[PDB]
């Protein structure tokens, strides 16, 4: 079998100085 | 021939000052 | 043969006071 | 013969008077 | 042979009180 | 065919004082 | 005459050991 | 005075570990 | 001065052969 | 001088085949 | 006059076998 | 108060014998 390592995934949201309605379209589909 | 597998996974999410029209639209097509 | 597989899922959420207009649209679809 | 290890679990969120007006959709598929 | 396969993924999201409304688009397919 | 090495990807969202109003659109197909 | 205020939820899948292995991230704020 | 509120939501999905990791991701906020 | 108010969600996953998805990310930010 | 609020939400998903790379990445924001 | 507010949004997925790796980026702001 | 008018948004995939690799980016960030 194949060997393998652990991971890490880490997500953190918050917005300082709310206002201003900002727009983000991203799109990063990995490869395998 | 010996294999293993770890993870971490940290979810953090506060929404703070205030109100605000935004949005955020993001895809991360995870792979193997 | 032996097998091993490890993980740790946190989640925190909160909101100070009330609601906030805002939308966050991440999709992270991710992989065992 | 499938072998795994113990795992760890945590959630924590605010208790929102009427359900949550804007928010935030992360989707994090997962293993059970 | 020996192989180890993993990664590491941070996410950090904070939208800083500017001018009205900027708008990011980015895509990035990949590559075989 | 080809040994993984370890690997760090960062996501980080911030608007970045630009002037009143700014768009940007970028899409990055791959090679053959 | 009493003010009407009801709602209509219907649930049905065939969960077989763990979900599709796919995912639906799909956030629809709203307010009841 | 007097008014009416009603809602519809339907959840109709067959699911067995399949094949295949899709993955689509949708953001629809919405008001009121 | 009669007020109505109605809304509808409708999901519908077919088996056999998991459902499309391949990596869709859709961000539709409503009207404040 | 009566107002009326409808809506409407359905996702459809049926795909046979088999796997598909395929990739989009839209933002819809709106107007203010 | 009158006043009414509707709308309607819908997202169908069906495919045969589509060629090897397609993708596209869209990002529409708006005007103020 | 205002009249008010309504929309309709359709998302439907269904490849059409497109190219092999195709990449479309299109970004509409602009005032008149």
Same mark, same amino acid.
């Given at each position: 079998?194949?060997?393998? /390592? /652990?991971? *890490?995934? %880490? +997500? +953190?949201?918050?917005?300082? $100085?709310?206002? *201003?309605?900002?727009?983000?379209?991203?799109?990063? $589909?990995?490869? %395998?």
């Amino acid at each position: 079998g194949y060997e393998v /390592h /652990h991971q *890490k995934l %880490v +997500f +953190f949201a918050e917005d300082v $100085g709310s206002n *201003k309605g900002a727009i983000i379209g991203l799109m990063v $589909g990995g490869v %395998v």
